[PDB]
Curated annotation (Swiss-Prot):
It comes from Escherichia coli (strain K12). GO terms for molecular function: D-mannose binding. Involved in regulation of length and mediation of adhesion of type 1 fimbriae (but not necessary for the production of fimbriae). Adhesin responsible for the binding to D-mannose. It is laterally positioned at intervals in the structure of the type 1 fimbriae. In order to integrate FimH in the fimbriae FimF and FimG are needed. Belongs to the fimbrial protein family. It is found in: Fimbrium. GO terms for cellular component: host cell membrane; pilus; pilus tip. Keywords: Fimbrium, Signal. One of its GO terms (biological process) is cell adhesion involved in single-species biofilm formation. The gene is fimH. Its main location: other. This is Type 1 fimbrin D-mannose specific adhesin.
Amino acid sequence: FACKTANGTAIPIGGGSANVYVNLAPVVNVGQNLVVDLSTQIFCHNDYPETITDYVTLQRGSAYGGVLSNFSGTVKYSGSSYPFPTTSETPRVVYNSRTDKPWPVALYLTPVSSAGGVAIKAGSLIAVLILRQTNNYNSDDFQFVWNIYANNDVVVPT
Ligand SMILES: CC(=O)N[C@@H]1[C@@H](O)[C@H](O[C@@H]2O[C@H](CO)[C@@H](O[C@@H]3O[C@H](CO[C@H]4O[C@H](CO)[C@@H](O)[C@H](O)[C@@H]4O)[C@@H](O)[C@H](O[C@H]4O[C@H](CO)[C@@H](O)[C@H](O)[C@@H]4O)[C@@H]3O)[C@H](O)[C@H]2NC(C)=O)[C@@H](CO[C@@H]2O[C@@H](C)[C@@H](O)[C@@H](O)[C@@H]2O)O[C@H]1O
Ligand code: NI
């Protein structure tokens, strides 16, 4: 089991960490959501699907920087919605093919009433999403830690 990004970085068998940059709507009002869909950027596969089933959760999602200070959020994982930052590890998604499948995570971030001006700075860390991978075969229990960075400034008009 391993993962890669559309930019080309990879996290190998056994887990590890990678940085992912995302494009953000440059203007967002109170009552509107920024949607950060990672399913177009993070892809994973099972290396031995004939004999092993891989189980994949969103173990935790954490906010940083301007998202932590200026937004409230939800995360959608595989069709179910949860608070973001998260309050518990999600149910598992089965990975059962060598063919890359997206990691089905999307953040929905909405400005708090005190947000105004540059609410997320270009280049800054906005979130960490931890993918936990286990299987039905051995003791393997690995973390794939995705550090999410804003490409661009996001402004909340005053
Ligand atoms: C009828 C019968 O029972 N046949 C059994 C064979 O099927 C069995 O072969 C196993 O098959 C498994 C697949 O289920 C393989 O596990 C994978 O191994 C990957 C690493 O393999 C290389 O490195 C090994 C040494 O470390 C070396 O032995 C191999 O030759 C390879 O070069 C590993 O990366 C992979 O795990 C990753 O991917 C999965 C799926 O996505 C994730 O869930 C994991 O988290 C991880 O990311 C997986 O573990 C074995 O490679 C393969 N071995 C061989 C030699 O072909 C054999 C093997 O014996 C078994 O393995 C040893 C170590 C020991 O525990 C034995 O008791 C086991 O039975 O046995 C036959 O009987
Ligand atoms: Ni592979």
